[PDB]
Amino acid sequence: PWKQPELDPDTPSPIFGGSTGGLLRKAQVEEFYVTTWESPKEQIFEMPTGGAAIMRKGPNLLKFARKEQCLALTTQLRTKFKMTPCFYRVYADGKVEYLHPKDGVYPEKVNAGRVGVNQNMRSIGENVDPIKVKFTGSQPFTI
Amino acid sequence: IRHRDAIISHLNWVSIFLGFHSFGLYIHNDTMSALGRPQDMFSDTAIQLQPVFAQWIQNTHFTAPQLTAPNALAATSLTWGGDVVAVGGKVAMMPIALGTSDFLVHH
Amino acid sequence: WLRDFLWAQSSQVIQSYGSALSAYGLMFLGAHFVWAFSLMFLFSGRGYWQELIESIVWAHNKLRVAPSIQPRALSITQGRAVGVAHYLLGGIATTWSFFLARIIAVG
Amino acid sequence: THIKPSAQVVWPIVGQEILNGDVGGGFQGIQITSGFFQLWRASGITSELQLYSTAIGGLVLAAACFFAGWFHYHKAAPKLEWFQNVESMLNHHLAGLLGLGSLAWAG
Amino acid sequence: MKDFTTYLSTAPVVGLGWAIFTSGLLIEINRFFPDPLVFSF
Amino acid sequence: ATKLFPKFSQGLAQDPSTRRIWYGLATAHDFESHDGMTEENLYQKIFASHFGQLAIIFLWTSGNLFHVAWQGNFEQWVTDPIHVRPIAHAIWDPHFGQPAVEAFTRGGASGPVNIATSGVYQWWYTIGLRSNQELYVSSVFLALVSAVFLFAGWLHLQPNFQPSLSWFKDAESRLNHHLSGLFGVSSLAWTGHLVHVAIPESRGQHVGWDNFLSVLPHPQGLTPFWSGNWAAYAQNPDTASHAFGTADGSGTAILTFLGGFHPQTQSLWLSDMAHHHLAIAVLFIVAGHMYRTNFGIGHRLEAILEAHTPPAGGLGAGHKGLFHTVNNSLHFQLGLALASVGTITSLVAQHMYSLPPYAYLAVDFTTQASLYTHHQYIAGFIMCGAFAHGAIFFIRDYDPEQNKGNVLARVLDHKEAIISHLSWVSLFLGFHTLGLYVHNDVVQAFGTPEKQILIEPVFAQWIQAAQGKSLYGFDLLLASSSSSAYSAGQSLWLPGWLEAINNNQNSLFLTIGPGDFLVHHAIALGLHTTTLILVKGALDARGSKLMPDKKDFGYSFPCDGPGRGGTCDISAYDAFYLAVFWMLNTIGWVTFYWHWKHLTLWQGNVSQFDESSTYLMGWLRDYLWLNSSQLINGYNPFGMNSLSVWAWTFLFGHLVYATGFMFLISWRGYWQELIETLVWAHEKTPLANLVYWKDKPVALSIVQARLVGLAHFSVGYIFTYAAFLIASTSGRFG
Amino acid sequence: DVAGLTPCSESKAYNKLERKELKTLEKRLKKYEPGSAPYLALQATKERTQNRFKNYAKAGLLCGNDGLPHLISDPGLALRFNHAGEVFIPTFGFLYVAGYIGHVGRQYIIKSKEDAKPTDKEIILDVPLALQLAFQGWAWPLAAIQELRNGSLLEKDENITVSPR
Numbered sequence A: 001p002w003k004q005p006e007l008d009p010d011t012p013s014p015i016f017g018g019s020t021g022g023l024l025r026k027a028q029v030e031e032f033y034v035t036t037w038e039s040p041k042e043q044i045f046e047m048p049t050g051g052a053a054i055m056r057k058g059p060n061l062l063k064f065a066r067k068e069q070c071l072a073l074t075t076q077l078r079t080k081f082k083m084t085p086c087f088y089r090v091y092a093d094g095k096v097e098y099l100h101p102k103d104g105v106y107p108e109k110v111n112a113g114r115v116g117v118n119q120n121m122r123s124i125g126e127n128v129d130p131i132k133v134k135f136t137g138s139q140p141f142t143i
Numbered sequence B: 001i002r003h004r005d006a007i008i009s010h011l012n013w014v015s016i017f018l019g020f021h022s023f024g025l026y027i028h029n030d031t032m033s034a035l036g037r038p039q040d041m042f043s044d045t046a047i048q049l050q051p052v053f054a055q056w057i058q059n060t061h062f063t064a065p066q067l068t069a070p071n072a073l074a075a076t077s078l079t080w081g082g083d084v085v086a087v088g089g090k091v092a093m094m095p096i097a098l099g100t101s102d103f104l105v106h107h
Numbered sequence C: 001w002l003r004d005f006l007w008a009q010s011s012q013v014i015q016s017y018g019s020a021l022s023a024y025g026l027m028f029l030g031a032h033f034v035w036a037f038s039l040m041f042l043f044s045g046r047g048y049w050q051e052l053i054e055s056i057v058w059a060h061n062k063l064r065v066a067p068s069i070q071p072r073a074l075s076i077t078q079g080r081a082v083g084v085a086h087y088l089l090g091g092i093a094t095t096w097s098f099f100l101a102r103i104i105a106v107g
Numbered sequence D: 001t002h003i004k005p006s007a008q009v010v011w012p013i014v015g016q017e018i019l020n021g022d023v024g025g026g027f028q029g030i031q032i033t034s035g036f037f038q039l040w041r042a043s044g045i046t047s048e049l050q051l052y053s054t055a056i057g058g059l060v061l062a063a064a065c066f067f068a069g070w071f072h073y074h075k076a077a078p079k080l081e082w083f084q085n086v087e088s089m090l091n092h093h094l095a096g097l098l099g100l101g102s103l104a105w106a107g
Numbered sequence E: 001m002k003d004f005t006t007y008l009s010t011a012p013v014v015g016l017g018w019a020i021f022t023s024g025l026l027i028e029i030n031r032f033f034p035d036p037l038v039f040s041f
Numbered sequence F: 001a002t003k004l005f006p007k008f009s010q011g012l013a014q015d016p017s018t019r020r021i022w023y024g025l026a027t028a029h030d031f032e033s034h035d036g037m038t039e040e041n042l043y044q045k046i047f048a049s050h051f052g053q054l055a056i057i058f059l060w061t062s063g064n065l066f067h068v069a070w071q072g073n074f075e076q077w078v079t080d081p082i083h084v085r086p087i088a089h090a091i092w093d094p095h096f097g098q099p100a101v102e103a104f105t106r107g108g109a110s111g112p113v114n115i116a117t118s119g120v121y122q123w124w125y126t127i128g129l130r131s132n133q134e135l136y137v138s139s140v141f142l143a144l145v146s147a148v149f150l151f152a153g154w155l156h157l158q159p160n161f162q163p164s165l166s167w168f169k170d171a172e173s174r175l176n177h178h179l180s181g182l183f184g185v186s187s188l189a190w191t192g193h194l195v196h197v198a199i200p201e202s203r204g205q206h207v208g209w210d211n212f213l214s215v216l217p218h219p220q221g222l223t224p225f226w227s228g229n230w231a232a233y234a235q236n237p238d239t240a241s242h243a244f245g246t247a248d249g250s251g252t253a254i255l256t257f258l259g260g261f262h263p264q265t266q267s268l269w270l271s272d273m274a275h276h277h278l279a280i281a282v283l284f285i286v287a288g289h290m291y292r293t294n295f296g297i298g299h300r301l302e303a304i305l306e307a308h309t310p311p312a313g314g315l316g317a318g319h320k321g322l323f324h325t326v327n328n329s330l331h332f333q334l335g336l337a338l339a340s341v342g343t344i345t346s347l348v349a350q351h352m353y354s355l356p357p358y359a360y361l362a363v364d365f366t367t368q369a370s371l372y373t374h375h376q377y378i379a380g381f382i383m384c385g386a387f388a389h390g391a392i393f394f395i396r397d398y399d400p401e402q403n404k405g406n407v408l409a410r411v412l413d414h415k416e417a418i419i420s421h422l423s424w425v426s427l428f429l430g431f432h433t434l435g436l437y438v439h440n441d442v443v444q445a446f447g448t449p450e451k452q453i454l455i456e457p458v459f460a461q462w463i464q465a466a467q468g469k470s471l472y473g474f475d476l477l478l479a480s481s482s483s484s485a486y487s488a489g490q491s492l493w494l495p496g497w498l499e500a501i502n503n504n505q506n507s508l509f510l511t512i513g514p515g516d517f518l519v520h521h522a523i524a525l526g527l528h529t530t531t532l533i534l535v536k537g538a539l540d541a542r543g544s545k546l547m548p549d550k551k552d553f554g555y556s557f558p559c560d561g562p563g564r565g566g567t568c569d570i571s572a573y574d575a576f577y578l579a580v581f582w583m584l585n586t587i588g589w590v591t592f593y594w595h596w597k598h599l600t601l602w603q604g605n606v607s608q609f610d611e612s613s614t615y616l617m618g619w620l621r622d623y624l625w626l627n628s629s630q631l632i633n634g635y636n637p638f639g640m641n642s643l644s645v646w647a648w649t650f651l652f653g654h655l656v657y658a659t660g661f662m663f664l665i666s667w668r669g670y671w672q673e674l675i676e677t678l679v680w681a682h683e684k685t686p687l688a689n690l691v692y693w694k695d696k697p698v699a700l701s702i703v704q705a706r707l708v709g710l711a712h713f714s715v716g717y718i719f720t721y722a723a724f725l726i727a728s729t730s731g732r733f734g
Numbered sequence G: 001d002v003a004g005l006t007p008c009s010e011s012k013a014y015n016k017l018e019r020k021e022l023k024t025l026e027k028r029l030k031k032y033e034p035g036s037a038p039y040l041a042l043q044a045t046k047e048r049t050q051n052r053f054k055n056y057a058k059a060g061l062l063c064g065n066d067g068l069p070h071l072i073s074d075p076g077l078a079l080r081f082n083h084a085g086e087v088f089i090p091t092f093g094f095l096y097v098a099g100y101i102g103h104v105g106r107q108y109i110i111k112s113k114e115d116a117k118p119t120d121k122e123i124i125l126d127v128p129l130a131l132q133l134a135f136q137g138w139a140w141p142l143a144a145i146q147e148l149r150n151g152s153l154l155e156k157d158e159n160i161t162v163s164p165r
Ligand code: CLA
Pocket: C033, C036, C037, C039, C040, C043, C044, C052, F423, F424, F426, F427, F428, F429, F430, F431, F434, F525, F529, F532, F533, F578, F579, F581, F582
């Protein structure tokens, strides 16, 4: 966005008991994802890693082992309460990377700031045959 | 829902253990029969894995009218034990004996 | 179980021809058929049948007999349902025919 | 103990009249295994007139049930509060659907 | 009536009618001509 | 990540999962997809792999020779080629019991042995091997041959000795040399060995290396060859009352055309085989000077392909541009080679049983049955491989700009018509074959079997009458003396060929009834349907209406997801994997027909097959149920006979078939979630979370799922049918 | 006497099969009183079996070594040996009926594709139109070959959807 928010580990977690689909050994060895949002009131939601939790009125922080769980929680909060959350990725060494709102306006919008990458300027079906690209390491769709 | 993973994992473990200690028993019997070792089988003559609990329950229910249901004239069924009831020369109901094969198929 | 239960029995089912039990044997054979016919609904997928249907659509379009309702392959869930239904029907009918023929011929 | 139970008779069309086996009692038909003969013997049914009357009453009750479905959908449809009375449903089912039915069958 | 007629105009109803007609025709042919195998008169 | 096991794939190296092992094994010999490699390196790897495959072949046959010579009864079988069964190899199983050891002691052995069904005993008796020392020296010689083939594989892969890319592309010289040397002079050497050794050994004269160069193969002594008086070789053939082991009733003839079979052993004559291989040798050597080598004469393959374009646009551009298509694409040549070798294997299966080339092979019923079944299954598998590699050619290396308007572009143009017509003929055959079979089964069920539809195979019966079979009647060729075909060569091979074809005991043109015609039409249905699946996969390999860009996704990809209605099993690999099922069913049908017809012929109850193959209940009862009595009684609580191993491997095959079902019905997601739960269980327990996996356990891929299910299915199919076939043919016959 | 097959009238095993079927029918018949419905049903079955065995004879039918009749397949051989009605004429009749069905379906498809929403006409049949086309297909081969002649039977490949190469 205008200024990228920084992850605060001291923000309170939502009211929830024990978890079984939560963090495995990958969290302490590889990266794990952390979703934060700002609940205006006390309400009950459903986590993608198990049953139901209650989010606190204020900042809420949750931890997941997969980015798909973070985006599932993000779209559940956006469709149900229009929450606009955001999740970071934390590596084993503590590096924090901002993932979902890269320009802060969500990928449904445009913002006229992003650069289109991995785009082919030809129509699909105009790609060359696999015989044309052989023993070269380049796929017909990568050119 | 909050401990479904533990539920499914323990159910998977007990399913694997039951499948091993029943179907592997069957395969063991087939192999040691094909290997010429009738004394190494899990049969009624070689290694008796008799259903002691089922046999005890059968004996208790055969004696259910004797002490615990004194107003019943006979047993509630003839599968526990007793005489053989036949109609028209064909066996209507007779006592059923449970052995090693019965334990194997029940497990 | 193969020899003393499935091969020792089921001789009445295959020898039921020329008698009143023959339909059972007929059903028996048909049941085997249905049990086989499910398998490619259980195996395979949808893209192969969709492309075969596309070729058949080309054939009917050459003769101008292509239907207005576009023929499509069965859905993956639909294909799984058809496969499990035909598989269960074949197995249940096989056991029904074999059981009834064996238990009527010698029972 | 000597005549097999039979309640299905086929039409002689393409040689399927061989399915009308010699069940005994001067009758030809398919040996039924549903046990309806034993149920009718347990119910005191002796002649075919009682079976005819039971069939007519069953057809009348089926027509009444179809009329009830049409009526309770199109004409007089119960509200959501009527269905949600689980206590009344349980009481009426335990007392009249099961208890009164058991008493009527005992009588 | 025309709603009922269009209901009978649906594919399963006309399929049932065709199946009944064809089965009855073949069954009456096989009954009145018992066991036909060889086309002779 | 970046593990060392997939050294041919960087992307597979950085795979932190168990799949890296599996894809590290299945993509082991797909050099075209290996990273950082060229066509020359691929060709050199192909050469080294071919040398290795050859060395493995020679090691396997050397091991067969050694395990027959050691712990075998080859000399006892030579003395008595009827009574004593052959021995394959000894059994040393510490898990065996005393009744198992006593029951497996057969053929006059000192321990448990396996009765050989391969047919090496009959073959080696026919070619002249008699002693165990000859088999020993043959085994060590073939081991040395495998050693020098290993030397060739290592040496031709070494630097400064690797052949150039164009060296493999020398199609004309390779064709000329492999026609002249690999086929021609090899057959000349084989018929020379036949004339020198096998015919004297079949005439009671021992010709070894010690007495070589001192025993004349023919009493005339090579002067008829120079003078052109080649009829002196066909002067004194072996009589009808001739013993194969001795010199009684012998003759002096090395080359002849004595048609039919040897009356004593019911096999083809050795002089006939020698003359056949000599004629094949001279014809192949003559044909091997066709193509243009470095000399000034020959034929150019590209020029022949350019010239054979029909006028008036019948085939469009014709066969133009096809030379570069065949030469550049290894998969085109692979498909052509596998198709031709499968056709040849099917020919071998269809001709060995009717024309037994080895002495005392027709009497060995189990051997002939196993050989036919093995050859037909191998043929079907490699025809499926031929079509699969043709689809691989269509996906990987096919340039429409190169061969534009030619036959390949034309069959790609009207591929819908070909697929639709194949689907039509398959539907027609299956519909009416099942209709007739069900009609006959219902008719036989009603107690009046005369209502069943029995179409006499008049076409094949008329063909067999045109070739000598007078039992069907008629007045065609080779059955009436007034026919020009009968008059031509009436003293050459007809006095033997008609004698062999008019006898009903042998398998040469057996009597065929309506059930034979019905099962042949079912075989035609199987062939047409398998062809339809394979050409639907191959023609729609690079594109379809559902998937236009199927060339960009490679040959073996799982699906495109649930979009566009569902796209599972859309690759040509999945079409091949379905056609493997259909090919297995087809070869099962042909082997069921062969086994039942030959079993009824050997038992003498040919009428049982004639009146029982009409309806499928006869197939289920009189063949599948009647002949399985001795198989399932191999081991029981009563005791054990010699067929206990066949019963065990029969149940083994049924179990592997069941495990194929396990891998085939369920696809991925249940197993992925189950493995996830197992991962949580292992991670969240004491005393076992200390040991951890280096590679993350994952569910097997959908392509891998199809491969594993197909492998278990085929293994169970093969083991079950081999068990039933061998047990039924050996429990009542010897 | 073609294909080594004896005629059913002069055959031997055909008579054995006939006597066996009559014998088991009489064995089933003897278990019932003559004035009973199962007796009448078994007598009708025996009469039908005798009539079928008589009608299979005196019709050129051939059977080989089992008494079960065989059908001569090749036309010409069937034409010159009085076996045309075994398979040569039944396939002609089947081709007539199959072409009737195909021509009626083709006419219905073509006439139903003209109006708006043809899928509704496909899934809700126009019964008067279907019955009119049902009774107008008695001359299907003449009409089919005439549409072949004028080219309306076939569609040009430029107007037919074609899968990508
Ligand atoms: C024995 C089991 C069996 C049977 C009968 C079939 C039958 C068929 N398969 Mg399948 N197949 C099977 C197993 C089976 N498959 C398995 C296990 C696999 C491996 C996965 C495959 C793989 C496979 C492929 C890859 C392909 C086929 C194709 C076909 C068709 C072949 C055309 C033919 O022979 O005429 C049809 C013959 C039949 C016997 C079909 C059954 C119809 C009978 C007569 C009943 C008809 C209805 C009847 C009147 C009853 C009506 C009432 C009832 C519906 C309730 C046909 C629909 C091909 C196809 O689509 O053809 C164009 C094709 O591409 N199959």
